[PDB]
Amino acid sequence: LDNNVVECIKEITESSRNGKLVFFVGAGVSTLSDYPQWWRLVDKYHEELYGSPKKGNYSSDEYLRIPQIFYNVKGEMAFDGILKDFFQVDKPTNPIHDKILAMNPAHVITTAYDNLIDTACWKRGKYFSVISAEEDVANATSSRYLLKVAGDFRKGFKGENVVLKEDDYLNYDQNYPLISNLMKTIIATHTIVFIGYGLGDYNINMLLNWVRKLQKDSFHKPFFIRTDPSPIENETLIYYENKGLRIIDAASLIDSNEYDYLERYSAVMDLLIESQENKFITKDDEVIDYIYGKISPLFALQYIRKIDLKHVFE
Amino acid sequence: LDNNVVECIKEITESSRNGKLVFFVGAGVSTLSDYPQWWRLVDKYHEELYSSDEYLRIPQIFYNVKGEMAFDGILKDFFQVKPTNPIHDKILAMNITTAYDNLIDTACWKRRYLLKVAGDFRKGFKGENVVLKEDDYLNYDQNYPLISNLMKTIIATHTIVFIGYGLGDYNINMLLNWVRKLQKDSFHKPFFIRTDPSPIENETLIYYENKGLRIIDAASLIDSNEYDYLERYSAVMDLLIESQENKFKDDEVIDYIYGKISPLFALQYIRKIDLKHVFE
DSSP, rough: OOOOHHHHHHHHHHHHHHEEEEEOOOOOHHTTTTTOOHHHHHHHHHHSSSSSSOOOOOOOHHHHTTHHHHHHHHTHHHHHHHHHSOOOOOOOHHHHHHHHTTOOOSEEEEOOSSSSHHHHHHHHSSSOOOEEEEGGGOOOOSSSSSEEEEEEEOSSSOOTTOSSSSHHHHHHHHHHHHHHHHHHHHHHEEEEEESOOOOOOOHHHHHHHHHHHHHHGSOOOOOEEESSOOOOOOOHHHHHHHOOOOEEEEEHHHHHHHHTHHHHHHHHHHHHHHOHHHOOOHHHHHHHHHHHHHHHHGOOOOOOOGGGGGGGGO | OOOOHHHHHHHHHHHTTTTTTEEEEOOOHHHHHOOHHHHHHHHHHHHHHHHHHHHHHHHHHHIIIOOHHHHHHHHHHOOOOOOOOOOHHHHHHOOOOOOSSSSHHHHHOOOOOOOBTTTSSOOOOOTTBOOOHHHHHTTTTOOOEEEEEEEEHHHHEEEEEEESSOOOOOOHHHHOOOOOOOHGGGGOOOOEEOSSSSSEEEEEEEHHTTTTTTEEEEHHSOOOOOGGGGHHHHHHHHHHHHHOOOOOOHHHHHHHHHHGGGGGGSSSOSSGGGGGOOOO
16 A cells, blocks of 8 residues: 555545545446447447448547548438437446445536436435536536536437537537536536546546646646556656646556456445545554544533534544 | 649649749658658657657656656757758749758758748757657647747748648647638648558548648559659659649630730730740
8 A cells, every 4th residue: 555545545535524526437437337338439430431340440540530531421310320329228337336426526527428427316316417518507406516528318319419529629619618617617626536537538638737737736636546457657657746647556456357447446446435544543643643633623612521522533 | 633633733833833832841851861750769768768649758758757868869869960852952943841850951052931840950959949749749839929920821821732741740730720710711722742652542532622621642643652752752743843734625725825815915016026925
C-alpha cells in the first residue's frame, strides 16, 4: 500500500461525508455490463462501407473517419437502421453501478449512450434530475443532477440525439453550451473522481488541461483509477501529476488476467467502501492525536451526557 | 488529364499567368532532398526512454525527465547535416512551409515573403525555436499570432497549392475548416496532390471532394508508388510547368483566336510588329 494513495482515499472519504464528490464514469462500465461496444460498431460500418471489414487497421483516424464516410456516402437512414439493429438490446446492470452510487454522489456525470446508470439510480432509491439535452436544464427539478455528455436514445433513435461524428464535436461548443457550463461548474466546485476510460477521451482530457490552464494549483487534482492490467509507466504517472492527475493503479493492488478488470473495478472500490480512518491508525501517538482532533474542539462546553458520546465515535 | 484535373490545371495556369499563387510546402519536400525523418527521432526518444499522442507525449516526458539539454544535443547531432531539388526549382519558377530546414531559403536566394510557419533554427538549436511538443502544439496559437494572421490573409489573397503535406498536423486544416466556415460558397478551393503509393479509393476521394479541397492524385493518373516519389511529382508539376493552351479541336481554336483578337476590334489600326505581342 502507498501512503499517497492512503491520503487520496482520506481526501475522497472526507469529501464523501461532506457530500461534495461527483463520479465521472467513462465507457468501461458498458464493457463490464456486456453492452455492445463501439469498436465493433466501427467494424460494422467498415464492412458495410468498403464492402469488406478486411483487416480494417482500425486506428484513431478510423474512429473518426468511417462514420463520416457512412454519413456522406450512404446517407442518414442507414445510420438509423444500423442504430436500431445494434443498440436495441437490453441487459441487467452490474454491482459496479450500485457500489458507484453507494458513495452518495451529489451529481453524476456520464459518457455512455446507455441508460443503465439511471435505472441503478432508481434502484438506489433517490431521484436524480436527468440532464441530457439543453432543454432539460430548464425543467431541472432536483438539486441532484444526472449530467449527460454523450446523450442517450430517450429522444428516439435520430441522429440529433446521438453524438458520434467529429463535426458534432466541432459544433459541440454551440450545440451544448449550458451542459459544458454545468460540467465546468461541477469540476470547479466539487471533487471529481474519474472512472470508466482508458486514457483515450482526449477531448475531455484537453478540457481537463483547459481548467488546468485556467486555475493552476487552486484546481483540486482529480483522481482516476487506472484499470489497465499492465504495470504503469511511473514517468507517465509523474507527467500526469505535472498535468495535475492523481492516478491509482488497479494492478498496484492486485493483478490477474486482463478480463478480470471488472473484479478490479470492484476491488479498489471495495477498498474504498470499507475504508476506515482507524484501520490505518497503527501507532499510539497517532491514536492520541486522532482523539485530540476528534474531541478537543469540544472544550467549550460545561457538561455533556455520556449517552451523547455514541454520536462522536460512529 | 481528367476533366476536373483539366479545369484545375486551367485554374492554376490562369492564376499563375497573371500571378496569384502560393505554394504551401508540407514535409515530404524535405525528404525529396533526403532530410532526416521526425518519427525516427521519436523512435530515438522512445528507445532512450525505453499513436499520434505518443509522438508528442514521449518528447513531453523526455523534456520533463531526461532534459531539454538532451533535446538540444540530439537536435545538434540530427539536423546539422543538404542541397536543393528541382522540385524546389519548379516551385519557385512557378512561384509557405512547415519544415524547419533552410533549404527552401537557399533555393529562394538562388533565384518574396518566405514564411516558415513552424519556426526555424536560424537563431539556434533551441526548443523555443521550433514546434515539436504537445504543449507547443497547444500553445502555438498564442505565441506567434502574426503567423496565423498572415496565413489567413494569404488564404484569401492568393491561390494555395499543397505539396508534400503528410497529414501529420490536422490543426492547419482545422483552421482551414474554420476559415471556410466563414467562406462557404466563396471557397477558392486549394489543391493537394494526394501522392500516396496506392490509387485513392472512391469513398476517400468522395469525402475529399465533398469537403471542398479539390484533389489531384498521381497514382490515379499513372502507376505511381511512394518508392518512385520524385517522378510522381515529375508526373504532375512538370505538367504544371508546361501548362499551355497547346495541351487544350477546331472550334475551340477559333474561339481562342477570337478571344485573343476581339479586344482589338474596339481600337484603331494596329501595328503589325506589335502583333507578335498578341500571340507572345
